[PDB]
Design a protein around this ligand. Structure first.
Ligand SMILES: N[C@@H](CCC(=O)N[C@@H](CS[C@@H]1c2ccccc2-c2ccccc2[C@H]1O)C(=O)NCC(=O)O)C(=O)O
Ligand SMILES: N[C@@H](CCC(=O)N[C@@H](CS[C@@H]1c2ccccc2-c2ccccc2[C@H]1O)C(=O)NCC(=O)O)C(=O)O
Lengths: 217, 217
């Protein structure tokens, strides 16, 4: 079957794990362990980083038969082409392209806070930027069932993940945006997703490595 | 015409500027001025950031009639689709997807150094990581004229830009990689490219905004 390599955290791999499940993919994972500090040992990964035939070794990586891919969004796009989960029209394509890039920014923003040694001090100000971020997703989605428009697409998995992560971070952040709350429930209600969420494979936390200041365990 | 909006620096907009040129796109630009330190005033942008109908306001932005796009890779992909500069096969699409994301990472690493107050002290270690990055690119391209294969695609624009930046940063960095040196010289050689580089519109440097420790003017 296919192999997905990543750390044994949620990190940025949740959309891939969820899409492998939604597509009924035949896969197994390598969940690399990282030692405790000070070292935060990575040998488990580093012993084999350059022995996998990856063009640009990284985590996550996906091996599918002959094919070897890195870069979470490239993996996501490969799986979407594979299972016909791309935007179909130019309009859907541009909406998807924008969402894909926008989620990664909002993800980088959260990461930058969560790896800041001055976390608690920076938090209040980070929390203040949430309503603005959420408002932009809320308005973009509007009354659409999915981000692209009519059909679930791979960007719905990206959006689910980052919305959920912000929701975990600040539990009241969706209260003013019922459509986003509805979107999370609609996503979570997709048959294979609901079954996966209750399964032994599910990893909702920790989101970050032991290194982080938040969701590090 | 289309309108491209971005700061009055190269930043991450280079590939876009270059693709508009290559596609003989009819466009006008809005190059937003940023104040000097210690304030680095952003009022020229900030005055109309929320007045342009962008779903997720940002720089760069591209307006093409009713269509409004943000996210530099979504801009690139819109233009790519419009001019048939995407991968044509599954193999080409995967190569282009990985390159796209890989450039952004190599770009984010350069920014991470170049905005660090400890830039000078951090430089030794950064320089040490350079050969590894260049080797990956070199090996990936291999004998192909272009990153996706036999034909130019939009990812040649992204790769050209980051390789050039690295090269500007560390001049001797491509000495070992004739293929990289050759790819730069090949890209710069494209008619529309050669012309643009000599035009009134070209802005090679500064690479970064005034807030940076390097290529900030
Ligand atoms: N843009 C690429 C980025 C690939 C990349 O940086 N990989 C990380 C793991 S991802 C990392 C992480 C490591 C542990 C815990 C959490 C994260 C994480 C979470 C959210 C978002 C970014 C991150 C990141 O902090 C890694 O450990 N790489 C193998 C190595 O360097 O040898 C992508 O989209 O795939
Ligand atoms: N993923 C998104 C990234 C959009 C984004 O962050 N935009 C920056 C300008 S781009 C910024 C930058 C600003 C000035 C000069 C250089 C850059 C730059 C250069 C290399 C790499 C990243 C950067 C970035 O640090 C900006 O000023 N935004 C409007 C604002 O906040 O009101 C994209 O790919 O398009």
């Amino acid at each position: 079957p296919m192999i997905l390599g990543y750390w044994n955290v949620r990190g940025l791999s949740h959309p891939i794990r969820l899409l492998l499940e939604y597509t009924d993919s035949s896969y197994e994972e390598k969940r690399y362990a990282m030692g405790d500090a000070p070292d935060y040992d990575r040998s488990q990964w580093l012993n084999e980083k350059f022995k996998l035939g990856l063009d640009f070794p990284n985590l996550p990586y996906l091996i599918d038969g002959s094919r070897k891919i890195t870069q979470s969004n490239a993996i996501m796009r490969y799986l979407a082409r594979k299972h016909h989960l791309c935007g179909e029209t130019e309009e859907e394509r541009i909406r998807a392209d924008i969402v894909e890039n926008q989620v990664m920014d909002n993800r980088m923003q959260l990461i930058m806070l969560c790896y800041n040694p001055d976390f608690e001090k920076q938090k209040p100000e980070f929390l203040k930027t949430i309503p603005e971020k959420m408002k932009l997703y809320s308005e973009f989605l509007g009354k659409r069932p999915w981000f692209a428009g009519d059909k679930v697409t791979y960007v719905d998995f990206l959006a689910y993940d980052i919305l959920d992560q912000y929701h975990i971070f600040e539990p009241k952040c969706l209260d003013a945006f019922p459509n986003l709350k509805d979107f999370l429930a609609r996503f979570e209600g997709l048959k294979k997703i609901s079954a996966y969420m209750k399964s032994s494979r599910y990893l909702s936390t920790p989101i970050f490595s032991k290194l982080a200041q938040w969701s590090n365990k």
